[PDB]
């Protein structure tokens, strides 16, 4: 039961991982996630504002 | 099912720049109103002509997982193999992350945290100076014991409490690789809290601040049976490395120097450094 | 026009004829506790309308030399209507808030205020390594004064304005939910704060959920007028409040 | 085969799970037998009732008195029968009960609790009692009017000689510390006369009550820790 | 058959709480009768109005497997590399789990047990104090030998019995990881018995108690060939870690302090601590 | 199974990723709860505005003055309002801003920046301002005629009280050092009177402006490094 | 001959195991079993009693 | 997907030799014109009769990957465990590849480079000579810390800065294998530059040469807690091994001996050695 | 997820590789590439010249 | 898992090929650019002409 995934590298490559312990806390760091969303802190307003239109 | 083949996360590159030409219209992207508490979303393409550029930069290294995914010293202490004072032959440290400044400041940028922990121990020994040093001693061995809150606490190096039957412990011998373990999320709440603006008693009395929620236990270390003809001093360093991290409610980084290990007390500090005048640029 | 806003909670209404948008916490609207997230067993009580209404919390006077003020919640509303009674009679509580801060002046006045809600605004004592009672930081609905100079009395909190009594740069408070009241183009600020905490519920007498701060970044100024000060008023309204753990009154 | 040793090699962790060689290869173990009473989880033990020594009056010449709660025929209209703190792992009352012993091996606990009271008076005696649980607060109740505000049950004594008060799990956190403090208080439990005890002629003027403690089906514990009740100074 | 894929055990969460409303009926869940020896199964939903709550808590950490699955010291002893007394240069320990208090109390909560054993040895050395200590000695080596009942027993460090041909043994050198082995279930009966209310002879005479069933053998340790010009003392600690455990017939935990290693003897103890009066709650 | 250890065995690297045994087997973690305001990348913080203390006049008795840029009714036709170097991680102006703090934890940075200016004068006051960004060069601008050659925007004060100057990313290298030097300079930013400020009778003769700094959506950082602003001499 | 199974983790993950020794006593602890039944000690009566109904 | 089976690279052998016979024609392969800057492509088959030969030689060992794929010392330094001078108890080295001559010359054959780095550390210790040497000391431990540009710098062995919370570090103990790590491509530009014909300031003033682009940071090393009664000296050697290399714009190898670590300064040197006369061949 | 490829040896042989780390910089040296082209430095002229034909 | 170390363990060979941990996890490298004049084998250099100093007359 092995997992194969790509590894970080511009535009110019696989590694295998296996878990040996029965506790999920023993796994290695999952530092491959890159999803993000800044609208929570930058646009917390109630009514959406179009950049082109005047603010008020 | 010999291979799972985890799908690619798909490198998320930053936004590109689109070509823009001369404009003359009633739209005014530049003008806005910060009174709304909304940060403007303008881009350089909206105020001057720009060429088309493909950006291959990525924000991989700025993730909270990577930002906090570095081991850092959190405590160091010394204990002697043999000495007159009983309290000086072993260490007793209440667990807390506020002792060392750098790691404290790093953590304090978020109000709440939830992560697994990876602990590593570095142990070194040295012979104390003295008039007579000629001796022969085999390799030393050390014991690390973790005592959850409310458990028995040893009072001397050779106490009965060192016979751990439920308390996890590690026996380590010098010359090998540093010891290591993994610790899951062990908070009674749903997340660790770096700050706590409240009291202990229901009548707004007693302890105040984050000291109230610190009940992680203790760590004890001793030489197993080493008792040299001459004193030998050892030092232990503890390193913490969060894993699988999640963070909430960011807060501004601290500015004033730390002064207490269990309080936010500080002294007023200037906002920043000064210069000759508002126009000086040299 | 989008410069006019109207808010109706319970049996009270707020109308502002000149205002900006309404900031909404971290993009989360207040809501009741879900079944799969609760921990207490017994049935909660949900006295909407009786408790979800606007409560004006006294008034301050803005002078040319003002430095700022702060209030701490929910203790500020400790003795305000049925909300106070419910908070007294219950072990656990949970509620979001809607904060509305009014301040109006003529076209010939100038000034700027920062309105910000700081969750878990822990504060340090005036003298390092010295404890203080629960009276130099919250005493009901009365507002507390910041100080331009460094505090010296050992029985009260460090009031140095530029550090915000938190050891952080005052200019960086923008990270928290906030709004600006600029007398040129604004008269009020509205903030909707969801319930933020590390546990589903908590006692409201022992824990200060969040702190409200008003700081004049540009000091008030005027010339040749009969008005000597600009009053400031604060109004709050709990939303989706529910209590639990009925006990004898504290 | 190239390899590199990571930190933690050659360390001895007392709570690890690794395979190791067998010192008695091809050993034939004795066949298994299904002995009655298999236990597969300490909670099964934790849910069994046990007597609570509520009568800790600092003057108990006879130890067995600790299990008997006195009751009298003539008492003021409203009077307190007993009161105690709800600290199952720390309070002296629950410290050594069958439930308390299990918790002392752990650091965190959560869930509801059951308190069962049995009236061991005469068959002709009768009475009513009010038992109330007060969540955490600034001050414990002092009079029945204060107690009756919180969770409570009115107990009537008749053919059924036992009544159960279920203490609900009301807390701001998912878990509570066994070594409880001001932050994680749990409240108080008190019992008061509702009507009083009445007896006919030719019966004893005093009676006794006993209390049983156990955990509900949602109870649980976490973080194993070494108990502090047992200690030694020299090898046996 | 490159992967078996063991089916999930299906996390068993604790029971949820169902919403309940006002009630007025002849059913009386609260009233019961403990005289039957039956513990009531009421829930908070049966006595007060409750909301619907989904519990994700699990009782994983309370299983007997995890409760007893921690290594604990069971014996420690000292022996010298060179000395005048022959009996002082090696150890001879009859195997038993009653020596150390914590592990004993943990085990004694069940009448019968059946498990595999994992044994780990921690060995440390130190140079004895003296007037002259300047010496050079290579790394030391130790031998651990297990002697089932009835086998020959050595009488001195250099006895012929140390040439084990059937008795399992371990040779270990300082500076490496601690030694370890696995031991299967080696009881003549169907399960280990912590208690035995009976005698040895058929006429109700002789040894009494659990001492009768203790026939697990002995353990012997010695320095292989180390014989220093000056004395060197070593200490050995033995750790037991049950595996694949099954338990039967739980019994109340002990209350009085232990006083003998092969008996249940004790001294009467108060039930618990005292307080001012029955109403004191402060 | 034959094996050979490669160099690097038994070393402790503080930034490694290896599996290790768990010290608390089969521990039950508390259920997760979705607290509002989750943050998944420091850039999300970096894009929030923060006030810039531009008025560092070496004579600020009152600290809060550092946030106010003076403006006067009567000034020469062309006059400079302020000037500063564009060193977000090194210059004293941007050193302690919400953006500057994040960069100081890294060594390389790239992308565009936003400077927002808000006029906090009276409602009857009016004026125009010229804000220009000058790429690196041998000499910074000295007069408006020099400044207007580079990138700039003419700001008109009206109902909209805020204007945004987007500093484009013009550089010979894909990245720039946080500890900037002559080689990796970034240029200058200056503001000048375009028309001047005019006020009617009965208004204050002076006003103030504030500046906000934030990063665009193409900003990024690299090479984590320990910040130099915080230090200690003895264990707390 | 490898076994793949899930590892402990609320509601937000596989590890591989292989046995190297010929004696079952050498295997690692099987601490993944969570089945339990308390009725043995809590309801040892002969006649089942309904909670709603009176005890006697 | 248990096996990918990477396709063969197909050994690229050198060109073969084709049989050629007598010729008499107007084609003149031998005659050319170097003025065009074009190197002639003639082969021995074009000027004399040749047999058919199959060449199995390959140019595998001449690839840039293999040419630079060898670890080489780049720096060595000494530090004492205990001494009066604080600056003498630890090392502080600004990273650069110009210190050691051989590796410098190897790299300087290409103008631009782009590669990953593999770093290995070799540490050795020795007891300083003195009148009294009889002492006993346990194994020593060392710490290596990497400080990116702009980070805090320690000023003494026991400074607070040694509590790395973000700076990567390695703790190593003597007697084990040498420490090692991998470093990715960390240049702000698109490739490392060995040469830079330019200035720092925009007015053609200030620092000149490749010293301007060197901003890789520092490395610090110290004994963790060793403090012997008598001095002990340690030496550290740093080895660099490029990986995944790409090179551009080759340049002629250097001829004059190096004289400065941050400059191209040199002294004029003869083109080559001499001989008796143009005809001497002995 | 294992890779199988040939290993260097005249005309007279497989090895397996697996990647254990999540960063491509940790992989081993890829010294199996032998493609090359010298025309860049030897024939940089604009008009191709035939060896047989005269240079000018 | 039983194992035995063969000779050569813990040695440092300067021409070995082994995987090692990365000290800067999830580092984002700068995008590649095709600079003119890439060289992939020293022979390419070796085939370029160069002037030979034949007149070594010791004078
Ligand atoms: C109030 N919180 C306490 C936790 N603190 C973070 C934290 C959490 C856990 C730890 N260590 C947990 C731990 C890990 C391993 C052990 F062996 C041990 F005893 C304890 C250290 C710091 C943030 C503030
Ligand atoms: C009367 N029983 C005896 C067993 N005791 C538990 C017990 C069982 C076996 C052991 N050790 C077995 C063992 C394991 C490994 C050895 F090398 C060896 F010699 C013996 C220790 C404690 C419970 C009470
Ligand atoms: C001007 N360039 C600088 C780089 N130099 C090549 C070079 C690049 C990087 C390094 N070392 C990078 C490094 C690798 C590992 C570390 F721990 C560390 F701190 C730094 C050494 C030489 C060529 C000339």
Distance B167 CA to ligand 2 centre (A): 21
Q: Give the single-character DSSP code of J34.
A: -
Query: Which residues on chain E are in Cβ contact (under 8 Å) with C43?
Result: 19-20, 48-51
Domains of chain D: 1-236 (2.60.120.20)
Domain that holds residue C85: 1-250
User: Is the minimum CB–CB distance between H180 and chain D shorter than 8 Å?
Assistant: yes
Burial G19-46 (b: 16+ CB within 10 A, else e): eebebebbbbbebbbbebebeeebeeee
User: Is the minimum CB–CB distance between J1 and chain G shorter than 8 Å?
Assistant: yes
CA H171 to the chain's CA centroid: 25
Instruction: Give the ranges where chain F is alpha helix by DSSP (H).
Output: 42-46, 92-95, 98-103, 144-147
- Structure determination method: cryo-EM
Residue A35 sits in a domain whose CATH number is 4.10.80.10
Task: Provide the token pair at H96.
Answer: 């650069």
- CA pair distance C74, C195, nearest whole angstrom: 11
Q: Report which of C73, C35, C41 is spatially closest to residue C55, judged by C-alpha positions.
A: C73
Instruction: Give the ranges where C56-211 is alpha helix by DSSP (H).
Output: 81-89
Chains J and I touch (3+ CB pairs under 8 A): yes
Nearest CA to ligand 2 atom 5: E97
Say whether H238 sits in a helix, a strand or coil: strand
Phi then psi for residue F213, to 5 deg, are -120, 140
First to last CA, chain F: 50
Residue of B91, B97, B188 best suited for mutating to test ligand 1, as the one with most atoms within 8 Å of CB = B97
Burial C138-155 (b: 16+ CB within 10 A, else e): beebebbebbeeebeeee
Which atom from ligand 3 is nearest to the alpha carbon of H113? 23
> Hey, what's the torsion of the CAs at D52, D56, D59, D62, to 10 degrees?
10
Inter-chain CB proximity D40 and G54 less than 8 Å? no
Q: What is the DSSP string of E101-161?
A: HHHHHHHTTEEEEEEEEEEEEEEEEEEPP-S---------EEEEEEE-TTS---SSTT-GG
Cβ B95 under 6 angstroms from ligand 1: yes
- CA pair distance B236, H121, nearest whole angstrom: 23
- CA pair distance I32, I13, nearest whole angstrom: 15
User: Are D121 and D207 a contacting pair, CB within 8 Å?
Assistant: yes
Q: Where is C237: in which H helix or E strand?
A: strand C230-246
- CA pair distance D2, D80, nearest whole angstrom: 77
- CA pair distance B215, B167, nearest whole angstrom: 16
- CA pair distance F194, I42, nearest whole angstrom: 61
Q: Which residues pair with D176 in a beta bridge?
A: D109
- CA pair distance G41, D214, nearest whole angstrom: 12
User: Are B180 and D14 a contacting pair, CB within 8 Å?
Assistant: no
Q: Report which of A39, F195, J28, E14 is spatially closest to residue H185, judged by C-alpha positions.
A: J28
Q: What is the DSSP string of D200-221?
A: -SSS-SEEEEEEEEEE-TT-EE
User: Are C17 and D145 a contacting pair, CB within 8 Å?
Assistant: no
Cβ B99 under 6 angstroms from ligand 1: no
Please give the residue of chain H at the shortest CA–CA distance from I50.
Answer: H29
- CA pair distance D7, F18, nearest whole angstrom: 8
Q: Report which of E183, E192, E190, E186 is spatially closest to residue E213, judged by C-alpha positions.
A: E192
Domains of chain B: 1-282 (2.60.120.20)
Ligand nearest to the CA of H245: 3
Task: Calculate Rg over the CA atoms of chain E.
Answer: 27
Cβ H240 under 6 angstroms from ligand 3: yes
Q: Report which of C30, C70, C95 is spatially closest to residue C244, judged by C-alpha positions.
A: C95
Burial H40-59 (b: 16+ CB within 10 A, else e): bbeeebbeeeeeeeeeeeeb
Model resolution, angstroms = 2.7
Say whether H157 sits in a helix, a strand or coil: coil
- CA pair distance D42, D220, nearest whole angstrom: 10
Nearest CA to ligand 1 atom 18: B146
H13, H64, H144: which to substitute to probe chain J, counting the most J Cβ within 10 Å? H64
Q: Report which of D142, D132, D140, D127 is spatially closest to residue D194, judged by C-alpha positions.
A: D127
User: Are H215 and H189 a contacting pair, CB within 8 Å?
Assistant: no
Identify whether J42 is preceded by a cis peptide bond (ω within 30 of 0): no
**Overall residue count recorded for chain H in this entry:** 282
Strands F2-5 and D2-3, bridge-based pairing: parallel
Query: B90 Cβ partners below 8 Å, 6+ apart?
Result: B79, B154, B156, B157, B220, B221, B222
Distance E78 CA to ligand 1 centre (A): 37
> Hey, what's the torsion of the CAs at C28, C33, C34, C38, to 10 degrees?
130
Q: Report which of C113, C246, C119, C104 is spatially closest to residue C175, judged by C-alpha positions.
A: C119
User: Are H162 and H237 a contacting pair, CB within 8 Å?
Assistant: no
Task: Calculate Rg over the CA atoms of chain D.
Answer: 24
Query: Which residues on chain J are in Cβ contact (under 8 Å) with A10?
Result: 29-32
User: Are B157 and B86 a contacting pair, CB within 8 Å?
Assistant: yes
Half-sphere exposure of residue H139, counting CA atoms within 13 Å on the CB side? 21
Helices (H) and strands (E) in chain A, counts: 1, 2
Domain that holds residue I17: 1-56
Number of domains in chain I: 1
Q: Report which of B250, D80, E6 is spatially closest to residue C196, judged by C-alpha positions.
A: B250
Q: Which residues pair with B114 in a beta bridge?
A: B246
Chains C and I touch (3+ CB pairs under 8 A): no
Chains A and C touch (3+ CB pairs under 8 A): yes
- CA pair distance C144, E225, nearest whole angstrom: 80
Nearest by CB to residue D173, choosing from C199, C205, C249, is: C199
């Amino acid at each position: 039961g092995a997992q194969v995934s790509t590894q970080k590298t511009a535009h110019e490559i696989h590694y295998t991982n296996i878990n040996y312990y029965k506790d999920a806390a023993s796994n290695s760091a999952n530092r491959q996630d890159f999803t993000q969303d800044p609208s929570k802190f930058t646009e917390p307003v109630k009514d959406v504002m179009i950049k082109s239109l005047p603010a008020l | 099912g010999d291979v799972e083949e985890a799908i690619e996360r798909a490198v998320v590159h930053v936004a590109d720049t689109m070509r823009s030409g001369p404009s003359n219209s009633a739209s005014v992207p530049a003008l806005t109103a910060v009174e709304t508490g909304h940060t403007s979303q303008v881009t350089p393409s909206d105020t001057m002509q720009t060429r088309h550029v493909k950006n291959y930069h990525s924000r991989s290294e700025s993730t909270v997982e990577n930002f906090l995914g570095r081991s850092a010293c959190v405590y160091m202490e010394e204990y002697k193999t043999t000495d007159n004072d009983v309290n000086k032959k072993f260490v007793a440290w209440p667990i807390n992350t506020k002792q060392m400044v750098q790691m404290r400041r790093k953590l304090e940028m978020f109000t709440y945290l939830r992560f697994d922990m990876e602990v590593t121990f570095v142990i070194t020994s040295r012979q104390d100076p003295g008039t007579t040093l000629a001796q022969d001693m085999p390799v030393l061995t050390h014991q690390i014991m973790y005592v959850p809150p409310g458990g028995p606490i040893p009072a001397k190096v050779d106490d009965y409490a060192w016979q751990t039957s439920t308390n996890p412990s590690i026996f380590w011998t010098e010359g090998n690789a540093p010891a290591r373990m993994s610790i899951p999320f062990i908070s009674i709440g749903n997340a660790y809290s770096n700050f706590y603006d409240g009291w202990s008693n229901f009548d707004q009395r007693g302890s105040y601040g984050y000291n109230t929620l610190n009940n992680l236990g203790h760590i004890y270390v001793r030489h197993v049976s080493g008792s040299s003809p001459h004193p030998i001093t050892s030092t232990i360093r503890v390193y913490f490395k969060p894993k699988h991290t999640r963070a909430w409610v960011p807060r501004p980084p601290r500015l004033c120097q730390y002064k207490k290990a269990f309080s936010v007390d500080f002294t007023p500090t200037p906002i920043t450094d000064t210069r000759k005048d508002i126009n000086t640029v040299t | 026009s989008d410069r006019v806003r109207s808010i109706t909670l319970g049996n009270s209404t707020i109308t502002t004829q000149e205002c900006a948008n309404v900031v909404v916490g971290y993009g989360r609207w207040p809501t009741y506790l879900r079944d799969d997230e609760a921990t207490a067993e017994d049935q909660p009580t949900q006295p909407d309308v009786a408790t979800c209404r606007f409560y004006t919390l006294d008034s301050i006077k803005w002078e040319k030399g003002s430095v700022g003020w702060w209030w701490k919640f929910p203790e500020a509303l400790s003795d305000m209507g049925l909300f106070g009674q419910n908070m007294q009679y219950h072990y656990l509580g949970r509620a979001g808030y809607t904060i509305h801060v009014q301040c109006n002046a003529s076209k010939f006045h100038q000034g700027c205020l920062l309105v910000v809600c700081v969750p878990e605004a822990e504060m340090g004592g005036a003298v390092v390594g010295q404890a203080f009672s629960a009276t130099a930081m919250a005493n009901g609905d009365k507002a507390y004064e910041f100080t331009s100079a460094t505090q010296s009395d050992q029985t009260k909190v460090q009031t140095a304005i530029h550090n915000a009594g938190m050891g952080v740069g005052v200019g960086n408070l923008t990270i928290y939910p906030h709004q600006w009241i600029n007398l040129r183009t604004n008269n009020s600020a509205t903030i909707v704060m969801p319930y933020i905490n590390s546990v589903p519920m908590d006692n409201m007498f022992r824990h200060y959920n969040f702190t409200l701060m008003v700081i004049p970044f540009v000091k008030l100024d005027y010339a040749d007028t009969a008005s000597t000060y600009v009053p400031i008023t604060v109004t709050v309204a709990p939303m989706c409040a529910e209590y639990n753990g009925l006990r004898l009154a504290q | 085969l190239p390899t590199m040793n990571t930190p933690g090699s050659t360390q001895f962790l007392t709570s690890d799970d690794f395979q190791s060689p067998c010192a008695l290869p091809q050993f034939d173990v004795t066949p298994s037998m299904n002995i009655p009473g298999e236990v597969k989880n300490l909670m099964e033990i934790a849910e069994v009732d046990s007597v609570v020594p509520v009568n800790n009056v600092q003057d108990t010449t006879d130890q067995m008195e600790m299990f008997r709660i006195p009751v009298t025929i003539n008492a003021p209209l409203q009077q307190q029968v007993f009161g105690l703190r709800l600290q199952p792992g720390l309070d002296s009352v629950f410290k050594h009960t069958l439930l308390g012993e299990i918790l002392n091996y752990y650091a965190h606990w959560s869930g509801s609790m059951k308190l069962t009271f049995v009236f061991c008076g005469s068959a002709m005696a009768t009475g009513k009692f009010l038992i109330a649980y007060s969540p955490p607060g600034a001050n414990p109740p002092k009079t029945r009017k204060d107690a009756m505000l919180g969770t409570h049950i009115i107990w009537d004594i008749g053919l059924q000689s036992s009544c159960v008060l279920c203490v609900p799990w009301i807390s701001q956190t998912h878990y509570r510390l066994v070594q409880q403090d001001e932050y994680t208080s749990a409240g108080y439990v008190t019992c008061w006369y509702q009507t009083g005890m009445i007896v006919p002629p030719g019966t004893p003027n005093s009676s006794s009550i006993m209390c049983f403690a156990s955990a509900c089906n949602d109870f649980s514990v976490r973080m194993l820790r070494d108990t502090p009740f047992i200690s030694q100074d020299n090898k046996l």
